[PDB]
Amino acid sequence: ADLEDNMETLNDNLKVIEKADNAAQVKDALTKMAAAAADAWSATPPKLEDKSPDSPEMHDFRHGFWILIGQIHDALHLANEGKVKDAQEAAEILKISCNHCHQKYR
Amino acid sequence: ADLEDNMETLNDNLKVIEKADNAAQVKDALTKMAAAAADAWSATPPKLEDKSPDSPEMHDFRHGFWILIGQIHDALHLANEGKVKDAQEAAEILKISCNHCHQKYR
Amino acid sequence: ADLEDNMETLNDNLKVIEKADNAAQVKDALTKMAAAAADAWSATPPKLEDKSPDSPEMHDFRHGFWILIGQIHDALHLANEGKVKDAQEAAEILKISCNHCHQKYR
Amino acid sequence: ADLEDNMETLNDNLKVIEKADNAAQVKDALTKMAAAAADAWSATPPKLEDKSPDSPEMHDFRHGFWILIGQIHDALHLANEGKVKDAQEAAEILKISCNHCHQKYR
Ligand code: HEC
Ligand code: HEC
Ligand code: HEC
Ligand code: HEC
Ligand SMILES: [Zn+2]
Ligand SMILES: [Zn+2]
Ligand SMILES: [Zn+2]
Ligand SMILES: [Zn+2]
């Protein structure tokens, strides 16, 4: 997918997590978010179109996806263990990761 | 890229790190490895073609890529900081992650 | 130090980071926070005195320190790469970890 | 506990994980290891006795404990999920972390 459609997938499943009823719903939403972030890994965002893929700025951009995926990784372990509510609370932390990359690069 | 091509990229660049003599070369190889792993994230390997994408096996498959990318992540900070020899030694750990996934799913 | 002492050290240095210039003020605050969190690792907080250190609740308690230390860990790499602004911005996510533990166990 | 006691705790419990036939012994051993590593956090090893707790060598020393605790963190999630064989294969990776610190600072 392109960067914009992966972002739609991130947003849709972030919402699913916040309103989920059970561990299966949380795990499915987290898995979909991680695959969307991994697929967006090599995207160049519009405001960085002039930057080398080997530059400090593009490493910072990808670093934002590493943070997001790492956060999803931990939440998914929690949901695998049945700590659904703790997994759901990880959405508050994820949201900041969204905001931070958006405020620098969107 | 397909799974086999991402693996060639992982293989080529792990050997680069093992033979490298400067920080820029290690950083460049680490970034290529991470992009290949992120691109391989949603691949289904031949031995899991019968498995549901939500199966435990496919989560465990993707989990091996998270481990690898996480190791690359820390090594890339060490390389960014000048600790070239430490970043280079992280290839010994990287290799164990290669072996573990291969033993299970290759 | 006891838990209350380490919490003050976290609180003071969390404020130092938000109100800092230069990698030095930030690095030094992060280093002290990591040492305080590590020293707190095995503390039994009042609301869990009836739980054994093998209980699920005590694992969930320590797990909140792992999240905190992992965030400090990444912030310190950023500060050591000269990314003082990005390091200072970790303070927002750190505070969320403070609050998530407090809401359950303080 | 002093550094020698925390190292004995790590050595004993790494062997427990290797020999283990059940999840409970793995989880218990990993918990003991994490506590030992957290307690060793602010130790000064003999070869750095003359240096500052703030020295770059001492940051680099502590960094080895973060690597170890992060690896224990993931293996404990796997043990908690009943993936006992996968948690035990994490011991191979832990050992390299033991060796990497010993080669530099023991
Ligand atoms: C960088 C590392 C990012 C992270 C992490 C997240 N997003 Fe993002 N997103 C990013 C950019 C550069 C853009 C701009 C796209 C463009 O073509 O200019 C976006 C865009 C979105 C959108 C589109 C909405 C709009 O502004 O019209 C959405 C809905 C969105 N992003 C959601 C989202 C969520 C929920 C995230 C975290 C879970 C998230 N994004 C992370 C870069 C990055
Ligand atoms: C799972 C999570 C894996 C990780 C981590 C790594 N590899 Fe891998 N590799 C994996 C599979 C399932 C396969 C088989 C793919 C197929 O279609 O048969 C492979 C294969 C390879 C190969 C051979 C590629 C080919 O042309 O057939 C190589 C050279 C290879 N892998 C290298 C490699 C390295 C160096 C890794 C770590 C840095 C690594 N792989 C990780 C699954 C997984
Ligand atoms: C659990 C994993 C915690 C994390 C992470 C943080 N804190 Fe905490 N804090 C915790 C407990 C159980 C308590 C109660 C201690 C008691 O004996 O009652 C506290 C308390 C505090 C306090 C008040 C200390 C006092 O004098 O009573 C402060 C100022 C405080 N905590 C700050 C703080 C900050 C800034 C944190 C993040 C950087 C943080 N705590 C994390 C448990 C946990
Ligand atoms: C640095 C960050 C280290 C990590 C990670 C591990 N160890 Fe270690 N170890 C370290 C030092 C500096 C020393 C010497 C301490 C001294 O005062 O001599 C050690 C020593 C040991 C020992 C011998 C203890 C003794 O009484 O002589 C053992 C058995 C040992 N270490 C085991 C061990 C294991 C199994 C580790 C990984 C799980 C490990 N150590 C990590 C520094 C560091
Ligand atoms: Zn966790
Ligand atoms: Zn690190
Ligand atoms: Zn980082
Ligand atoms: Zn994991």
D22: left (phi over 0), alpha (psi -120 to 50) or beta: beta
Helix (H) / strand (E) element for B97: namely helix B84-105
Method: X-ray
Our mutation pick for probing the ligand 1 site, out of A10, A42, A63, A100, counting the most ligand atoms within 8 A of Cβ, is A10
Inter-chain CB pairs, A–B, below 8 Å: 40
D70 close contact with A: CB closer than 8 A: no
**What's the CA gap between C14 and C88, in Å, rounded?**
10
Q: Is the alpha carbon torsion for D54, D60, D61, D66 positive or negative?
A: positive
Phi, psi of A57 (to 5 degrees): -75, -40
Q: Give the total residue count for chain D.
A: 106
C-alpha distances (whole Å) from B105 to each of A32, B58, D27 are 22, 10, 26
C-alpha of D84 from chain center: 18
Tell me how far CA of residue D92 lies from CA of A13, A103, D19, D34, in angstroms.
Answer: 36, 41, 13, 16
Containing A10, the helix (H) or strand (E) segment is: helix A3-18
Report the gap between the CA of D49 and the closest CA in chain C (Å): 18
To the nearest whole angstrom, how far is the Cα of B3 from the nearest Cα of chain D?
A: 23
Burial A72-92 (b: 16+ CB within 10 A, else e): bbbbbbbbbbebbebbbbbbe
Q: Contact, B88 vs B20, CB < 8 A?
A: yes
Contact C48, C59 (CB under 8 A): no
CA atoms within 13 A on the CB side of B23: 10
Closest ligand to the CA of A78: 5
Q: Locate D71 and state its tokens.
A: 């690896």
Distance from the alpha carbon of residue B14 to the mean position of ligand 4, in angstroms? 29
User: What is the Å distance from ligand 5's center to C62 Cα?
Assistant: 10
**Dist. CA B69–CA D61, nearest whole Å:** 23
CA distance B12 to chain D (A): 22
Q: Which atom of ligand 3 is nearest to the CA of C48?
A: 12
Distance CA D32, CA D13 (A): 7
In whole angstroms, what is the distance from residue A23 CA to residue A29 CA? 10
Using CA atoms, how far apart are residues B79 and B59, in angstroms rounded to an integer? 30
Give the span between the Cα atoms of D63 and A57, in whole angstroms: 26
* B45 and B20 Cβ atoms separated by less than 8 Å: no
Task: Select from B13, A27, A63, B3 the least CA-distant residue to C77.
Answer: A63
Which residue of chain B is at minimal alpha-carbon distance from D78?
A: B60
| b/e burial code for range A9-37 (CB count within 10 A of at least 16 → b) | bbeebbebbeebeebebbbbbbbbbbbbb
Half-sphere exposure in the Cβ direction for C50 (13 Å, CA) = 2
CA Rg, chain A, in Å? 14
Q: CA separation (Å) from A38 to A34, A35, A80, B36? A: 6, 5, 20, 10
N-terminal to C-terminal alpha carbon distance within chain B: 18
Ligand 2 binding site (Cβ under 6 Å of any ligand atom):
B 3-4, 7-8, 10-11, 14, 45-46, 61, 64-65, 68, 94, 97-98, 101-102, 105-106
List CB contacts of B30: < 8 A, sequence separation 6 or more. Answer: B13, B17, B72, B75, B76, B79, B87
Cβ neighbours, 10 Å, residue C15: 12
Point out the ligand nearest to the CA of residue C61: 3
Q: Which two tokens stand for residue A12?
A: 């849709």
Of C91, C74, C4, which is closest to residue C39 (Cα–Cα)?
C4
Q: Touching check for C77 and chain D: CB below 8 Å?
A: no
Task: Inform me whether the C-beta atom of residue A15 falls under 8 Å from chain D C-beta atoms.
Answer: no
DSSP string, D1-70: --HHHHHHHHHHHHHHHHH--SHHHHHHHHHHHHHHHHHHTT---GGGTTS-TTSHHHHHHHHHHHHHHH
Could you say which ligand is closest to the alpha carbon of residue B40? 2
Q: Is A50 helix (H, G, I), strand (E, B) or coil?
A: coil
Distance (angstroms) between ligand 4 centre and the Cα of D11 equals 8
Question: Which of D35, D39, D66 lies nearest to residue C69, judging by beta carbons?
Answer: D66
Is the sign of the CA dihedral C45, C46, C47, C50 positive or negative?
positive
Burial level of C44, CB count in 10 A (0-12/13-18/19+)?
A: middle
User: What is the resolution in angstroms?
Assistant: 1.9
CA A31 to chain centre: 10
**CA proximity to C70, closest of D72, D101, D39:** D72
**Distance to chain A for C60, nearest Cα, Å:** 10
User: Does any CB of chain C come closer than 8 Å to the CB of residue B81?
Assistant: yes
Q: Does A70 touch chain D (CB under 8 A)?
A: no
How many angstroms separate the first and last alpha carbons of chain A?
Answer: 18
How far, CA to CA in Å, does B17 sit from each of B10, B29, B32, B98, D31?
A: 11, 6, 11, 15, 34
Only one residue has tokens 């392109």, namely A2
Tell me if chain B has a CB within 8 Å of the CB of A3: no
As a three-state string, the secondary structure of C4-72 is HHHHHHHHHHHHHHHCCCHHHHHHHHHHHHHHHHHHHCCCCCHHHCCCCCCCHHHHHHHHHHHHHHHHH
Please report the domains of chain D, with CATH numbers, ordered by start residue.
Answer: 3-105 (1.20.120.10)
For chain D, report the end-to-end CA distance as a whole number of angstroms.
Answer: 18
Ligand 1 atom at shortest distance from the alpha carbon of A33: 38
Q: Count of CB atoms within 10 A of residue D12's CB?
A: 13
Q: What is the DSSP letter of A48?
A: G
Whole-angstrom Cα distance, residue B101 to residue B103?
5
Q: Residues of D42-63 as b/e, b for ≥16 C-beta within 10 angstroms?
A: bbebeebeeeeeeeeebebbbb
CA atoms within 13 A on the CB side of A13: 22
The crossing angle, in degrees rounded to 10, of helices B23-40 and A56-80 is 50
How far apart are the C-alpha atoms of C40 and D64, rounded to whole Å?
19
DSSP 8-state class, residue C2: -
Whose CA is closest to atom 27 on ligand 4?
D4
